[PDB]
């Protein structure tokens, strides 16, 4: 919804996200999946530089992604690490929503 929230939901300090821990918190409330971007925030913010009105943009560069995917056991996950481009909703120069991996 805003940069601060996007940060809280999608930027990670570690590639090895503890899915079973984080996913069970109120922010995620055992949802099926969540994509975390392993990067300093600036390279992420830069994706949206100069974009004012809401617009989906696919990153030009590739980023380290860590996805928490639910298994057959509710609220129990598998961490999958990958490298890919991603689509974000940019608004007033910052990412406000995560769209998807690989394409808009």
């Amino acid at each position: 919804q805003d940069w601060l929230t996007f940060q809280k939901k999608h930027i990670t300090n570690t590639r090895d996200v503890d899915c079973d821990n984080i996913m069970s918190t109120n922010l995620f409330h055992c949802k099926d999946k969540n994509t975390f971007i392993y990067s300093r925030p600036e390279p992420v913010k830069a994706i949206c530089k100069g974009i004012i009105a809401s617009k989906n943009v696919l990153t030009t560069s590739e980023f380290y992604l860590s996805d928490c995917n639910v298994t057959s056991r509710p609220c129990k996950y598998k961490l999958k690490k990958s490298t890919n481009k991603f689509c974000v909703t940019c608004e007033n120069q910052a990412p406000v929503h995560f769209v998807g991996v690989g394409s808009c």
Side-chain angles (χ1 to χ4, degrees), residues 2-104:
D2 48 62
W3 177 229
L4 205 98
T5 304
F6 180 90
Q7 285 178 90
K8 280 198 179 191
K9 298 177 175 172
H10 303 278
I11 292 162
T12 185
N13 283 313
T14 175
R15 261 199 107 4
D16 304 306
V17 179
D18 197 12
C19 303
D20 296 348
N21 199 344
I22 196 144
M23 301 293 282
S24 64
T25 64
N26 294 162
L27 191 65
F28 297 109
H29 59 74
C30 301
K31 62 204 289 281
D32 290 354
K33 190 199 180 80
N34 197 65
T35 303
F36 298 80
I37 306 145
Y38 174 56
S39 166
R40 295 189 62 194
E42 30 288 328
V44 173
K45 202 190 189 185
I47 299 152
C48 298
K49 190 151 164 54
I51 296 183
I52 311 298
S54 293
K55 190 189 201 194
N56 285 174
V57 174
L58 180 71
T59 64
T60 58
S61 297
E62 303 218 326
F63 287 79
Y64 278 116
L65 302 180
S66 288
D67 279 286
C68 287
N69 302 316
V70 77
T71 65
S72 69
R73 313 178 264 157
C75 212
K76 305 281 188 217
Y77 303 82
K78 264 191 188 112
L79 172 73
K80 176 168 145 301
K81 299 187 263 178
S82 67
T83 61
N84 217 335
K85 289 173 165 145
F86 65 80
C87 181
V88 284
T89 298
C90 285
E91 185 182 18
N92 201 28
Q93 313 201 250
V96 296
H97 284 299
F98 189 90
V99 179
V101 172
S103 178
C104 283

